[PDB]
């Protein structure tokens, strides 16, 4: 029930790593060299219809990150998105990050979320976090 | 069902849906901040917002500020039971200032559903096929 | 129904910082001195078994986060993971970060998602947005 089409002859069908992956890999269609500090849109060349009920979360690599300090921005992938899915990767490194085609260089999960309707009210019911916030709950 | 919000102060604006199946409501600064590279702010949203049950509030970053300006959002975590401002940790890991005027969307707001599971110690778990597997343990390719 | 087990005497059972926190609070069973602009793989020493139907999503703490310049990579922990939670820790902050064993240093947070089986298909639906993004809506 995730739908995807390739838009190009260089996207890679995505594959779950295991069988209770929360991700499906995210394969890059083309090469990139990402200098240290910088970032690039990796294109995967696909289009998907997430099913309804969630969006598509483009969520980091545990390897990448701890190996070479590789992360993922941005990376909601909205349910009416039908362009082509791009994977924003940053090389936080000191070294420079080399994506080669058919590289699993991000995975994508389906967050299951609600579209609630907003609200606009005057005063909102207390709570007893209340305003805490922001380390409120202490070190440890 | 309802996200609930309300205004903490005039320079407040009612977060927006993007797109008609937009994940999320877009959230607008309620202030101007210059943002150094490779430095941090906690933009104020100046509202404060009801999280339907079962959920709690991501504050994501956009992808046009993320491809193009380098800015990410930090923390993000906005709990069922906060009722206080609305923080956008915002990083920009960007080689130039970044600037947000008020009225800038700089993040969205998504509804994430959760459970809220009980914690239970046991002795050991069942195993998986994946077992202590990760890290890369499936490969790069 | 979130079971977890004590991998050594170092761990520490999560908690809660609130009635309704999303996350369980992670505890370091180490120490780590993180220099700035440099990465670390905070061991947690326990496994976990997520409920049916969620992932645990390692998230950043604000207080870290706004005070520190802390912020959490990686962060996808499998339904079927039962290996050593490790929290990806990032020090982009212009100090040393000092994680000392038994401080709260990220969140767990039982994201629920989809497993759905994936379909390739020859196009998709057209919608309103299409292939707008990054940034397609505008700044303001
Ligand atoms: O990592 C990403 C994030 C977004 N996108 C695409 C899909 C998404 O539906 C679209 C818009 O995403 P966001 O709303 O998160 N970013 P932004 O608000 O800047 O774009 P827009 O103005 O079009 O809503 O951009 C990607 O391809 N990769
Ligand atoms: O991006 C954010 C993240 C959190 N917050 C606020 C709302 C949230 O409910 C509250 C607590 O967030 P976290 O638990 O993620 N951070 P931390 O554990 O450091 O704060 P606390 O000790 O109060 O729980 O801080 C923001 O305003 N913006
Ligand atoms: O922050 C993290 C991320 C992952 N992990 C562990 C648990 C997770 O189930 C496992 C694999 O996570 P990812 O799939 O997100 N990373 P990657 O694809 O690089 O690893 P693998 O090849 O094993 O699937 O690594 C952590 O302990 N901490
Ligand atoms: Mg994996
Ligand atoms: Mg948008
Ligand atoms: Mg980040
Ligand atoms: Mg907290």
Known sequence: ????????????????????????????????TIPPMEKAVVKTDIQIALPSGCYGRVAPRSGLAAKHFIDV???????????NVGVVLFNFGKEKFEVKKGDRIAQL????????????????????????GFGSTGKN
């Open 73 to 83: 921005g941005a990376g909601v992938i909205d349910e009416d998105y039908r362009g």
């Open 1 to 32: 029930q995730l739908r995807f089409a390739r838009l190009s002859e260089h996207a890679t069908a995505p594959t779950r790593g295991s069988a209770r992956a929360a991700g499906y890999d995210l394969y890059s269609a083309y090469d990139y």
């Open 109 to 132: 999960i389906c967050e299951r979320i609600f579209y609630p309707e907003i609200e606009e009210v005057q005063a909102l019911d207390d709570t007893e976090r209340g305003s805490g």
